[PDB]
From a paper:
The Lis1 protein is conserved from fungi to mammals and is a key regulator of cytoplasmic dynein-1, the major minus-end-directed microtubule motor in many eukaryotes. Cytoplasmic dynein-1 (dynein) is a minus-end-directed microtubule motor that is conserved in many eukaryotes. Structurally, Lis1 is a dimer of two ß-propellers, and Lis1 dimerization is required for its function in vivo. Structures of yeast dynein–Lis1 complexes, while not of high enough resolution to build molecular models, show that Lis1 binds to dynein at two sites: dynein’s AAA+ ring at AAA3/AAA4 (sitering) and dynein’s stalk (sitestalk), which emerges from AAA4 and leads to dynein’s microtubule binding domain.
To enrich our sample for complexes containing two Lis1 ß-propellers bound to dynein, we used a construct of the yeast dynein motor domain containing a Walker B mutation in AAA3 (E2488Q; herein referred to as dyneinE2488Q) that prevents the hydrolysis of ATP as our previous work showed that this state results in Lis1 binding at both sitering and sitestalk. We also added ATP and vanadate to our samples as this is converted to ADP-vanadate, referred to here as ADP-Vi, which mimics a post-hydrolysis state for dynein. In our structure, dyneinE2488Q’s AAA ring is ‘closed,’ which is seen when dynein’s microtubule binding domain is in its low-affinity state, the linker is bent, and when two Lis1 ß-propellers interact with dynein. Binding of Lis1 at sitering primarily involves the smaller face of the ß-propeller in Lis1 and an alpha helix in AAA4 of dyneinE2488Q. Our high-resolution structure also allowed us to unambiguously map an additional interaction between dyneinE2488Q and Lis1 at sitering that involves a contact with a loop in AAA5. Lis1 binds to dynein at sitestalk using its side and makes interactions with coiled-coil 1 (CC1) of dynein’s stalk, as well as a previously unknown contact with a loop in AAA4 (residues 2935–2942). As suggested by the continuous density in our previous low-resolution structure, the Lis1s bound at sitering and sitestalk directly interact with each other. The ATP binding sites at AAA1, AAA2, AAA3, and AAA4 are all occupied by nucleotides. While our map shows ADP bound at AAA4, we were unable to resolve whether ATP or ADP-vanadate was bound at AAA1-AAA3 and chose to model ATP into each binding pocket.
Author numbering:
A (entry chain A): 2890 to 3034
B (entry chain A): 2623 to 2682, 2686 to 2822
C (entry chain A): 3291 to 3573, 3582 to 3624
D (entry chain B): 139 to 213, 216 to 350, 355 to 392, 397 to 400, 405 to 494
E (entry chain C): 139 to 213, 216 to 351, 354 to 392, 397 to 494
The structure:
């Protein structure tokens, strides 16, 4: 198992003719945009996102990594993939393999956060509505007497 | 020679073949032998075009991309081309059992995972067959290797190499694994990581 | 009594109507805010303020491009930090900077990963020790008996801070990667050559006061890396505090007491405003509502009184800024 | 078989926080779904009805209607789909994850400008569609997958209060006492029907089964696929109508009231057809069983709830994918629900 | 009679709320008990199966196995006892109240330290015992009336996955691919059997019957005096093997020269792991992960009929009715439970 091909010790393993002649090399590399999209689609399919209006944007095809965008979830997946690529570009990783760890962790955090935030929003709105109804009923009763 | 041996192994453990089946099998073996070491996507596309040109020139067939060829013996009694979704469902249930039995890890199953475990399977099914997996960290290398070894009934030996360890401890681990493999016929899958050297 | 109650609750009615109007905008910006906060939490832990700003700019470009509305006035501390958390952290000894508040929020909201603390000033060890009190156990990779003490802490359920993080020992990889095995109602992890029980009251923190150290690639991709590096605002604040303490301690103590008391008063006011709505929602009332209203007015009056000193402290701050800048 | 009749007492008694507004029945499992005025959604196990299997505050105001469906894909995995409409002006589409016994919000439908009244679900070869009606006198049609609307029209001068779907034709009942049949895909009015003197409460087709009204009369009606319909209003009268055959892209014309059932002391609220008989709840705290052949009341469940009786549910008997079990559920204004089994 | 072979389609279809992990048949009445991964416990009348007769959620996790027994008291009143084991590390004993059509818990048995994976019930003259195995590598014996343990032995290095009981002998398969037969009351191992390459899923004796059947007739008068000769096993190896048990030195004693089994036949043809096996007359039925049920002929060792795609997922368990016992009449029916949250019933 080799994570960094260009290390001092790992390049010695890859170069070593004793290993290189017997082993079968499987260059797994890093994830492509299709694998990223599949994983993100699977994780964000259990969180309440499509609870609001959404106007489908008009963007170039090469900027889209999922299927053609039809809902908010596709937009979210594309945004996450794009930001991961941009972050790895700015941090000047170069050709070094890019772990998908940040991507996966961000996805899990987003799920865990959206759940609670949506629940809190609707519960607070329900409380406000009940309070308003109580006040209106009390006003009606006062006007009765 | 590797390509010849792979073709023989696939034929000897396969159903009644047809010309199209033979050609697709040969293409799959060529993929596994040659193109698994390729790094860039451009090189992989060039290799796919090379396969198409070779087949047209010498052996005048569906789409023979890497993900369009799925040969496995995990779903039947013989090595044959399998359907994608059946393999996905089978792997999902098997991985649920694996998590419930050995180590619980929340793994999401995608297509490249299926391909990688298929090729790890064909490599661990061979005789004197070893792997060198190269990829970024947290891409499921060790987890998939353990899963496939569990599928094939191997015994996994991850060396417990830590800080303040020397040649004696590694030698003891190696000698123990070798002695088990010989005197007890315990088919073993030894996972050596770069952090252990 | 009914008319007086309605007149007292008119303010609550105004707030509730405002909230009802703002509901649609809040629901529209919810997903964008959540995306921004999650990315802030999982990426920005190891970047300075300038890099955080640039990445926020990039992320907001992306959000705008794909038609995902967000809060134009977004601010990480406002969205993900509550007043109770701020008070507890400050009482524990955390610096008053906003950067440290963001980093502490990042550290304390990581239930999955293990927070790695790059803290050259060794302040966070004391801060966390104050936060967890007696449970805190201090270890380091450079000592003997480390493995046995770690096993005892895991079995018992202490909070563990391991120092010298640049000398990582791979014997704790199972704890780092959370590769447990569930045995009925028991959870076992394999440290060394024998399994131990995981209490569930056990947390792990890795501390290292050495920037430009070395983190093995196995550890770096599995921990939440957070930086605690001094910046301009912290230096200015510390310099001003020392200057005021050595110039006139009376103003220093008075300012600190007023600040703490104001924070407590705002917290209590928020609690009262929540409790009134809960009392209405859980329906005697004509009595409890008036008691809560009177308490709210008393606290508001005290808060209004407490604001008569801040101009003096602003003048003092303006009188001492040159020292901080230089 | 189809002649089962409920006993004189309910087998189960379920208590909730608020007035029950809609009750549905899981097509395959012994599970009942309950919606209240507090916007909370309940799932109750029919054998342990002291604690909900799951609960959820779905809306911020009262829920007005709901509907369920077990998807049938000929390619994917099938699951139960729950759709609810409330006074929030929003429609929420949930999914019942029986593996974990919990809910799963998929998406929400937006666009109605005022309180929504009724919803419906149905499946084509592989397409799932939804329907809705609101006080803004609009009837909207939605795509379950994409989530955006596919059709919109105004079939009533006043506001629609109830709809039902059958193939490509939708019949709507408004606060104005007239019913109306329209052709769904093209949005063309086909005919109307008058005779009630109070706002309609329910309206639904009568489906052809292998009975007096469930059998086609002519061959042209056989080709069309439907002949009759039923409705109930605050007139305290239930009427069986007849749909004049259109100029078959249909082209338009009056519903012939060929029957009338009376006896309820207050507004008739909900109706449901199970084989021969016909069940109807009303505000008089009663449930009536009407013989479709004779047109006479057979059995009465008096004083079932202290308050009004809001809704009834019975398993569909004319669908090859819905086995008609022997159970029904009644939801009442008094925070209680009654379940009859076997 | 006994040559009844099920038809090409089931006569019932039962829908449940989770994956079916174990199924059983009432030995007297047309009633089926079904277990699920939620720990629920159902009971369907076999002619009106659209509603359960009763339901019960006694466990907090997945039920792994269950077994039934109709008590035969010679001098008390008879009833039906149902026992279920789950991953709750517990075993629950129920009584089926027939007239009210309800379940009635009796007690729970504690003591196992990890996942319990099998249970068995059998009756002596007027005694009832329960056997159970778990991941703690211990096979325990319990008393139905008292409720406390009576024996506890560890016969395997890995964890025991399946057991069967014939008189005073218990044969056990384990996660290790080896079988083992021990004498229950004395708790002493007698003989082992190896040859499988994957963990054992099921194992049971082949009881003697009067008729001719290949493996259901003794070979020597010693076997007639000992009452059993053959056992059958199923493993994740996609194979079914018939073993012939060596004779011990009758408390028995392991004869060193005769302490190993002898696989006399191996049945192949399944595409994946074999999950359950059952024997009726001259036929052996099996279900596997390949979504199919086989029917082998015990004489020729061949597959007579195949039920392809009976379930859309894995087929977890079978159940036929015991024929070697006089008190249980072998009715013509069998039930299958699968991962697709459905159970099929074949009748007549
Ligand atoms: N498909 C996936 N879905 C979810 N997590 C994944 C996936 N692939 C890899 N991971 C992550 O990678 C880790 C497991 O992979 P592992 O084999 O331990 O890593 P490596 O071998 O690359 O060091 C976990 O953190 C896991 O979340």
């Amino acid at each position: 198992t080799i994570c960094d091909p260009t290390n001092n010790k790992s390049s010695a393993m890859i170069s070593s003719p004793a290993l290189f002649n017997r082993c079968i090399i499987n260059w797994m590399g890093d994830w492509d945009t299709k694998t990223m999209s599949q994983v993100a689609n699977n994780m964000v399919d259990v969180v309440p996102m499509e609870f609001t209006d959404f106007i489908v944007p008009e963007v170039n095809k090469e900027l889209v990594f999922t299927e053609p965008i039809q809902t908010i979830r596709d937009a979210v997946v594309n945004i996450l993939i794009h930001f991961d690529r941009n972050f790895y570009q700015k941090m000047k990783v170069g050709v070094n393999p890019r772990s998908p760890g940040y991507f996966i962790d961000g996805l899990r955090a987003l799920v865990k956060l959206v759940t609670a935030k949506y629940q809190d929003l609707q519960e607070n709105q329900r409380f406000v509505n009940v309070g308003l109804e109580k006040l209106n009923e009390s006003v009606l009763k006062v006007n009765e007497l | 020679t590797r390509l010849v041996r792979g073709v023989y192994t696939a034929i000897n453990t396969g159903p009644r073949q047809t010309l199209r089946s033979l050609i697709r099998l040969w293409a799959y073996e060529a993929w596994r032998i040659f193109a698994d070491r390729l790094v860039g996507v451009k090189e992989k596309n060039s290799f796919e075009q090379l396969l198409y040109e070779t087949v047209d020139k010498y052996l005048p067939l569906g789409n023979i991309s890497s993900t369009s060829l799925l040969f496995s013996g995990l779903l039947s009694l013989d090595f044959k081309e399998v359907n994608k979704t059946d393999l996905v469902n089978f792997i999902e249930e098997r991985f649920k059992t694996f998590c419930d039995e050995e180590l619980e890890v929340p793994m999401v199953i995608h297509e490249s995972m299926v391909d990688h475990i298929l090729r790890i399977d064909r490599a661990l099914k061979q005789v004197q067959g070893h792997m060198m997996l190269i990829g970024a960290s947290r891409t499921g290398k060790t987890i998939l290797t353990r899963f496939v070894a569990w599928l094939n009934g191997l015994k996994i030996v991850q060396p417990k190499i830590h800080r303040h360890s020397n040649l004696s401890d590694f030698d003891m681990i190696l000698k123990k694994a070798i002695s088990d493999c010989s005197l007890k016929e315990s088919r073993t899958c030894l996972i050596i990581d770069e952090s252990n050297i | 009594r009914s008319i007086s109650l309605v007149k007292s609750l008119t303010f609550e009615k105004e707030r509730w109507l405002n909230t009802t109007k703002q509901f649609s905008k809040t629901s529209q910006e919810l997903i964008g805010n959540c995306i921004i906060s999650s990315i802030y939490e999982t990426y920005f832990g190891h970047l300075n303020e300038r890099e955080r700003g640039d990445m926020l700019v990039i992320l907001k470009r992306l959000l705008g491009k794909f038609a995902v509305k967000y809060d134009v006035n977004y601010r990480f501390i406002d969205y993900l930090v509550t007043l109770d958390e701020k008070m507890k952290w400050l009482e524990c000894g955390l610096d008053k900077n906003d950067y440290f508040l963001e980093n502490m929020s990042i550290v304390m909201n990581s239930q999955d990963a293990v927070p790695f603390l790059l803290d050259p000033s060794s302040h966070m060890i004391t801060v966390i020790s104050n936060y967890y009190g007696n449970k805190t156990v201090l270890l380091s990779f450079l000592e003997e008996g480390f493995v046995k003490r770690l096993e005892n802490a895991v079995r018992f359920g202490s909070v563990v801070i391991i120092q010298d993080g640049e000398f990582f020992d791979p014997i704790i990889s199972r704890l780092i990667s959370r590769e447990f095995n569930h045995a009925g109602n028991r959870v076992t992890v394999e440290i060394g050559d024998h399994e131990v029980d995981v209490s569930g009251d056990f947390k792990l923190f890795i501390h290292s006061c050495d920037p430009s150290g070395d983190i093995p690639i196995f550890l770096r991709s599995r921990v939440r890396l957070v930086h605690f590096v001094t910046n301009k605002e912290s230096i200015e604040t510390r310099i001003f505090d020392i200057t005021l303490t050595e110039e006139n301690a009376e103003m220093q103590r008075k300012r600190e007491d007023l600040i703490k008391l104001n924070t407590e008063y705002r917290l209590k006011l928020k609690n009262l405003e929540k409790r009134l709505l809960e009392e209405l929602n859980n329906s005697e009332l004509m009595v409890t509502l008036n008691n809560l209203k009177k308490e709210a007015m008393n606290i508001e009056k005290k808060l209004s009184e407490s604001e008569e000193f801040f101009p003096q402290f602003d003048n003092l701050v303006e009188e001492y800024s040159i020292i901080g800048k230089h | 078989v189809l002649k089962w009749i409920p006993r004189n007492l309910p087998s189960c008694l379920i208590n909730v926080e608020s007035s029950v507004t809609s009750v549905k029945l899981h097509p395959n499992l012994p599970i009942v779904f309950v919606a209240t005025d507090h916007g909370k959604l309940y799932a109750f196990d029919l054998f342990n009805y002291t604690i909900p299997l799951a609960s959820l505050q779905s809306h911020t105001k009262a829920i007005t209607s709901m509907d369920v469906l077990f998807t049938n894909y000929t390619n994917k995995k099938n699951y139960l789909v729950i759709v609810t409409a409330s006074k929030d002006l929003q429609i929420h589409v949930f999914k019942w994850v029986s593996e974990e016994c919990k809910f799963q919000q998929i998406r929400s439908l937006l666009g109605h400008e005022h309180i929504v009244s009724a919803v419906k679900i149905w499946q084509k070869n592989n397409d799932v569609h939804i329907a809705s009606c609101s006080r803004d006198q609009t009837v909207k049609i939605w795509d379950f997958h994409n989530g955006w609307s596919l059709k919109t029209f105004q079939p009533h001068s006043q506001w629609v209060r109830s709809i039902d779907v059958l193939g490509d034709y939708i019949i709507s009942g408004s606060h104005d006492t007239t019913l109306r049949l329209t052709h769904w895909p093209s949005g063309n009015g086909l005919s109307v029907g008058t005779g009630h003197e109070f706002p309609i409460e329910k309206v639904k087709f009568i489906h052809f089964i292998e009975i007096r009204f469930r059998t086609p009369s002519t061959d042209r009606y056989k080709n069309w696929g439907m002949q009759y319909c039923v409705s109930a209003s605050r007139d305290r009268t239930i009427k069986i109508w007849e749909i004049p055959l259109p100029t078959l892209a249909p082209i338009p014309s009056n519903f012939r009231c060929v029957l009338t059932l009376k006896g309820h002391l207050s507004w008739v609220r909900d109706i449901s057809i199970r084989g021969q008989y016909l069940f109807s709840c009303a505000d008089d705290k009663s449930v009536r069983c009407w013989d479709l052949n004779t047109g006479q009341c057979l059995h009465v469940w008096e004083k079932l709830h202290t308050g009004f009786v809001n809704c009834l549910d019975l398993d569909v008997d004319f669908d090859s994918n819905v086995t008609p079990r022997q159970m029904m559920v009644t939801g009442g204004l008094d925070c209680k629900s009654n379940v009859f089994m076997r």
